Each structure stands twice: as structure tokens, then as C-alpha cells.
Amino acid sequence: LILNLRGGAFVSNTQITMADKQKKFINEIQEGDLVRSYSITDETFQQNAVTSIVKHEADQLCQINFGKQHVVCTVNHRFYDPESKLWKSVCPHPGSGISFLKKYDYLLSEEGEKLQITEIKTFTTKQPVFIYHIQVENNHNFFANGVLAHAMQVS
Amino acid sequence: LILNLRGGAFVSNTQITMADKQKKFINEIQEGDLVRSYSITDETFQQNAVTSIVKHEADQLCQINFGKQHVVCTVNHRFYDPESKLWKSVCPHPGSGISFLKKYDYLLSEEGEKLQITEIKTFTTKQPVFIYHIQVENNHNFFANGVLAHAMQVSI
Amino acid sequence: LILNLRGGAFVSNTQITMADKQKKFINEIQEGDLVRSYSITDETFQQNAVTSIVKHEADQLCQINFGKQHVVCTVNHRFYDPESKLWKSVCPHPGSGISFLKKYDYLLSEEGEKLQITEIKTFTTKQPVFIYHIQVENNHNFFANGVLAHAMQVS
Amino acid sequence: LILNLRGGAFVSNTQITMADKQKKFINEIQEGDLVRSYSITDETFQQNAVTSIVKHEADQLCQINFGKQHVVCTVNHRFYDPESKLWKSVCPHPGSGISFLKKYDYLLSEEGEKLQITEIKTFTTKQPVFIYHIQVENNHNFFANGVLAHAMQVSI
Numbered sequence: 001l002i003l004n005l006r007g008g009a010f011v012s013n014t015q016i017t018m019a020d021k022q023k024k025f026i027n028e029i030q031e032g033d034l035v036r037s038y039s040i041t042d043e044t045f046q047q048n049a050v051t052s053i054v055k056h057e058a059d060q061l062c063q064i065n066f067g068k069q070h071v072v073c074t075v076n077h078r079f080y081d082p083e084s085k086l087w088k089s090v091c092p093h094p095g096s097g098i099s100f101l102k103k104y105d106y107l108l109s110e111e112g113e114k115l116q117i118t119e120i121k122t123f124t125t126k127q128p129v130f131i132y133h134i135q136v137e138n139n140h141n142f143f144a145n146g147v148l149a150h151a152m153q154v155s
Numbered sequence: 156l157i158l159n160l161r162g163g164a165f166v167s168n169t170q171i172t173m174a175d176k177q178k179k180f181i182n183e184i185q186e187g188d189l190v191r192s193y194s195i196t197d198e199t200f201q202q203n204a205v206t207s208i209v210k211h212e213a214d215q216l217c218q219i220n221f222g223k224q225h226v227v228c229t230v231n232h233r234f235y236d237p238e239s240k241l242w243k244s245v246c247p248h249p250g251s252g253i254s255f256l257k258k259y260d261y262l263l264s265e266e267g268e269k270l271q272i273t274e275i276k277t278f279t280t281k282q283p284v285f286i287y288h289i290q291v292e293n294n295h296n297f298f299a300n301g302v303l304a305h306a307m308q309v310s311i
Numbered sequence: 312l313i314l315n316l317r318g319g320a321f322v323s324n325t326q327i328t329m330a331d332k333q334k335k336f337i338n339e340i341q342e343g344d345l346v347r348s349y350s351i352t353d354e355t356f357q358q359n360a361v362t363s364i365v366k367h368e369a370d371q372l373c374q375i376n377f378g379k380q381h382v383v384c385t386v387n388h389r390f391y392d393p394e395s396k397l398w399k400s401v402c403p404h405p406g407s408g409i410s411f412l413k414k415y416d417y418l419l420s421e422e423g424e425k426l427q428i429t430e431i432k433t434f435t436t437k438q439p440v441f442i443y444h445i446q447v448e449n450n451h452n453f454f455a456n457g458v459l460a461h462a463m464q465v466s
Numbered sequence: 467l468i469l470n471l472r473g474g475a476f477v478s479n480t481q482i483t484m485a486d487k488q489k490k491f492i493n494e495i496q497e498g499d500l501v502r503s504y505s506i507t508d509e510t511f512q513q514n515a516v517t518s519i520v521k522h523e524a525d526q527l528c529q530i531n532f533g534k535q536h537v538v539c540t541v542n543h544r545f546y547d548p549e550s551k552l553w554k555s556v557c558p559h560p561g562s563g564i565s566f567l568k569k570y571d572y573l574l575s576e577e578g579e580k581l582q583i584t585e586i587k588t589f590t591t592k593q594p595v596f597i598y599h600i601q602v603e604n605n606h607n608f609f610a611n612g613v614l615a616h617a618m619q620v621s622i
């Protein structure tokens with residue numbers, strides 16, 4: 001079949017925050033682990049279940065800074081700008097309804113606080129490195145290094 | 156990230172032949188597990204390691220009967236026919252270079268026998284069911300219910 | 312840009328039922344042309360313009376017989392079965408929520424009759440033939456050799 | 467059925483360089499029209515027929531300036547950088563083998579000169595606009611507002 005790992009994939013060293021606000025590296029996540037998610041509409045946090053993990057590799061990645069704290073993923077990531085109230089990407093697929101993510105846009109923290117993007121750069125690796133896409137039921141999002149990231153595998 | 160699973164996917168029940176010819180359900184297989192692979196060009200068997208497992212859901216499936224034996228997978232699969240010397244799918248995507256898999260075509264067993272397909276059926280579930288795709292390192296193939304299948308995770 | 316042509320493509324000598332009631336070979340269809348379409352919802356016939364025509368190649372085709380007439384197309388077509396009230400393909404994509412088209416299933420005639428599928432055959436050409444995908448406005452369906460086929464390009 | 471438009475698509479008023487060095491708006495190009503092309507290995511200009519035009523729509527677009535002149539396209543374009551000798555994209559797919567396109571990278575003019583990229587913007591539009599992918603035989607490339615662009619209609 002054809003899968004759309006939409007919201008992209010994160011490097012092994014990326015930290016996912018649990019329902020108990022603890023942190024584990026995405027490559028140590030397992031089916032049924034309970035992670036901190038966010039209802040956009042109801043404007044409230046809530047625990048949800050990891051259904052699926054997909055492991056790929058890539059040599060071409062994207063670093064986003066939001067203060068001293070950063071995150072490394074594919075260019076087809078999806079993050080929430082709570083000030084803009086839009087899902088955004090550096091590289092959105094034509095006809096997804098996702099806005100362009102830019103330098104000095106906002107991300108939503110795992111404490112629901114607005115964080116300002118300080119820098120956005122491309123990043124190649126000498127050889128390919130592992131990347132991970134996790135699916136979360138109902139909310140379909142989580143917190144990668146403490147900011148709200150959407151993730152869904154479809155088709 | 157748009158990921159093409161080339162071999163399609165198999166129901167959780169599907170038996171995988173391990174390097175040492177023991178059987179393991181595909182929903183038990185873990186990264187690093189050593190599976191009975193096959194070098195097509197060389198016509199020689201080989202042990203190889205699983206690097207990736209992908210789980211998705213489907214309620215539209217395909218049952219290939221080859222005598223009394225059978226395998227249940229997605230309709231876009233890739234089984235090797237050792238008579239025609241071709242990888243075959245019941246439902247090839249246009250201009251993919253995969254031939255139609257038809258009634259009375261041949262599959263390759265884990266021993267290296269030619270096994271004849273006696274029936275191809277559609278199978279529908281009233282609930283979506285879990286399906287599994289395994290990436291094998293070098294030869295990117297394995298024995299599903301005793302017959303040779305290709306599988307590959309490819310980025311687009 | 313990745314473009315899913317929902318409804319597949321038809322060979323050159325496939326007959327399209329025009330607005331003007333006459334038949335026309337799909338390889339002659341031009342943008343603006345008005346074809347006979349159907350509203351499944353309204354259960355009435357309508358005239359709609361062709362907004363887009365994709366042309367491609369293939370050597371692997373699907374023949375569907377209904378009475379003493381047939382249609383030739385890619386295996387990932389989409390036809391309406393009026394008996395079941397479902398869109399069907401011989402080869403549906405798992406995710407698509409499309410049902411299997413089978414022997415003795417029904418198609419909808421351009422005059423709203425239920426015609427029985429007598430034979431479905433998968434065949435090859437010695438070298439590729441041109442296949443055509445036509446998008447139709449608002450209804451997104453037309454009549455191929457007198458039976459109702461869906462077609463819609465999306466990203 | 468599933469069709470990858472490798473090379474993205476251009477806005478209707480984008481200019482295509484014809485074989486005789488005349489210009490035509492891409493939204494007027496027709497099957498059999500002759501366009502200017504480049505062989506990278508031969509490092510010479512060829513003339514080729516357009517075999518296929520695919521028309522879609524988009525609200526997310528990309529503008530690339532090379533001095534006074536610009537080109538507007540989808541973010542999954544492919545332009546030849548003749549300085550680094552690589553096909554490039556603002557937004558390449560993780561496994562495509564395509565480098566990133568950035569400020570102060572180069573493009574190849576329809577007369578064979580390096581043209582420096584001076585600006586890359588990404589802009590939403592409020593209503594979707596028409597966009598056009600064209601298939602050129604043999605070289606699968608053409609000149610879009612005077613710079614070398616790749617385009618190919620491939621099944622998955």
C-alpha cells in the first residue's frame with residue numbers, strides 16, 4: 001500500500017513527554033505508551049495511546065530553534081502556531097491546507113505557553129540516520145522536545 | 156513523508172520462516188530477527204535480519220490458495236513466480252513492471268519447490284484488521300506461509 | 312506533486328456519453344465538452360463540463376463484460392453498483408473505502424438500467440496503449456461504453 | 467492511477483521557451499509543441515515535443531527571483547544548478563536524492579549562462595490558482611521564464 005506519514009518523522013534523540021509529564025527518547029516509545037496530547041477545539045490537554053510506530057532513515061533533515069531548545073525532523077513536519085491558530089510546515093504538500101512555517105512564528109509548549117522560533121535551517125548528514133513517526137489516537141498529536149507536533153499515517 | 160510499502164502487507168496470522176526454519180507469526184517479528192531469505196540471481200538461500208516492521212489496517216484483503224495451503228495479504232503484494240521468473244501481483248499498479256498474478260501461476264516454497272496457485276479470492280472483514288510489512292536487510296524478501304514474498308519501504 | 316487519479320483511466324476507443332446525446336472516443340474529449348453525469352444523491356442525470364484531461368500509457372488493462380458489451384480500463388477504476396448503492400473497483404486501495412467489483416455485480420446504464428457484470432478479465436497488450444483520465448465538474452462521474460464511472464484528480 | 471509529477475508545476479503566465487526561441491504561456495502549450503531542452507552530459511541544447519500537460523490547482527506557491535526576472539511554481543519543483551552540477555528543490559522529498567535550493571545558488575539560462583538566485587519567498591494565495599506540469603520527451607526538462615526546469619509524469 002501507499003502510506004502518508006503526515007506530520008513527518010523525528011530523529012531517534014527526540015524526546016516525547018508522557019501523560020505523567022516524564023520524557024522518553026522517541027526510539028524507546030512502544031505501542032500503548034501514554035503520551036501528553038492536546039485538544040485544539042476543547043483547548044485542554046489529555047492522555048492518549050500510541051497506536052503505531054514507523055522507523056525510516058533520511059540524510060536530509062530540518063532543524064528548528066525556539067530559544068536554546070531545538071528539534072530535528074523531516075521538512076514535511078506539522079506544528080501548531082497557537083498565536084496564528086494554524087497547522088504549519090517549512091514544506092507543506094500542495095492541497096493539504098497547511099500554512100508555511102517561518103522564522104519568528106510561534107509553537108505551543110507542553111505547558112501550553114507560546115514559544116517563538118529563533119532559527120530554521122536545513123541539515124544534511126554524511127550517511128542516513130534513523131527517523132520515527134508515532135500515531136496517537138483521537139488527538140493525533142504529541143510533544144517533541146516540548147512543542148505540539150501533529151502525526152497521522154493514512155491511505 | 157509519503158512511504159510506499161512495495162510487498163504490501165500480511166494478516167497477523169501469517170507465518171514467517173526464521174533463519175533456522177522455525178515459524179514465527181509476523182505480529183511477533185522484531186527488528187534484528189534473522190529470516191530465511193533467497194538470492195534470485197544465484198538461486199541460493201540466505202539468512203538476513205529484519206530492520207523495520209510497519210503495522211497498518213485494512214478490511215479489503217486477498218486470499219491466495221496454492222492447494223490446501225493459503226496466504227492472506229493486501230491485493231497489491233509481490234510474490235515470485237519461479238516458472239515465469241517474474242515478481243507478480245493480483246493488482247499491479249500501472250507501469251510498475253509487475254505482471255498479473257493469476258490462477259495456476261507458480262510460487263516458490265521455502266524448500267525451493269514450485270507450488271501452483273489453485274484459487275485467488277477477495278476477502279472482506281466487517282472490522283478493519285491489523286496488517287504487517289517487514290523490511291529484510293539485503294535481499295528484501297522472505298517466506299510468508301512457506302512461499303517467497305518481496306517487501307520494501309521506499310520514500311517518495 | 313503527487314496526484315491520485317481516483318477512477319483510473321480508459322483506452323482510446325472507450326465511448327463517452329456526451330451532453331448532445333451522441334457518443335465520442337475519450338481521446339477526442341477536449342476541456343469545455345459537456346458529458347452526461349449522474350447525481351447518486353439526487354438520483355437524476357445532469358450535464359457537466361470536462362475541466363481536466365490526463366493522458367498516460369499502460370500494457371496491463373482490465374476488461375469488464377455486461378450483456379454483449381464491454382469496457383476496457385486500468386484495474387484501479389471506479390464504477391457505481393446501483394443494486395448495492397456502492398462505488399466498486401476490481402483492485403481497490405485498502406484505505407479508499409471502495410468495495411470489490413465482482414462477477415454478477417451490477418453497473419448503472421446511461422438510461423438508469425441495472426446491467427449485470429457477466430465476465431471480468433485481466434489482460435496484457437504486447438506494447439503500451441494510451442489511457443485517458445477525464446475530470447468532470449461537481450458530479451465527477453461520466454458514462455464509459457454506457458455505464459457510470461467515477462473520476463477525480465486530487466493531491 | 468497514482469501519478470508522481472516529479473518537477474512540480476508552474477503558474478499559467480509562466481513562459482516556456484519554444485524550439486525557435488519564441489515564448490508561449492504554459493497555459494497555452496499543447497501536445498506536439500516543440501520546446502528548448504538541455505542535455506547535462508552533452509552540455510548542449512536539444513529540441514523536444516511536449517507529450518502531456520497535467521493541469522491542477524494550488525494556493526501554496528513559491529517565487530524564485532534571479533535579478534529582475536522571477537518564476538512562480540509549487541515547492542516540489544526541480545531546477546538545475548550549473549555551478550554545483552545538481553538538480554535542486556526548495557522542498558525536496560527525504561529520499562529523492564535532491565539537494566536544497568537556497569539564496570545565492572545558480573540556475574541555467576536558455577542561453578547557457580549561470581543566473582544567481584537573489585530571493586526565495588513562500589506565499590499562500592486566498593483562492594487556488596491553475597498550475598501546469600508538462601512532459602517533454604527525451605530530456606524531461608525545459609526553460610521556464612528562461613531557466614532550466616525538470617518535469618516527469620511517473621507511476622508509483
Ligand SMILES: [Ca+2]
Nearest residue numbers: 168225226227
Ligand atoms: Ca489462514
Ligand SMILES: [Hg+2]
Nearest residue numbers: 062090121122
Ligand atoms: Hg528546513
Ligand SMILES: [Hg+2]
Nearest residue numbers: 217245276277
Ligand atoms: Hg485477490
Ligand SMILES: [Hg+2]
Nearest residue numbers: 373401432433
Ligand atoms: Hg481485472
Ligand SMILES: [Hg+2]
Nearest residue numbers: 528556587588
Ligand atoms: Hg519557496
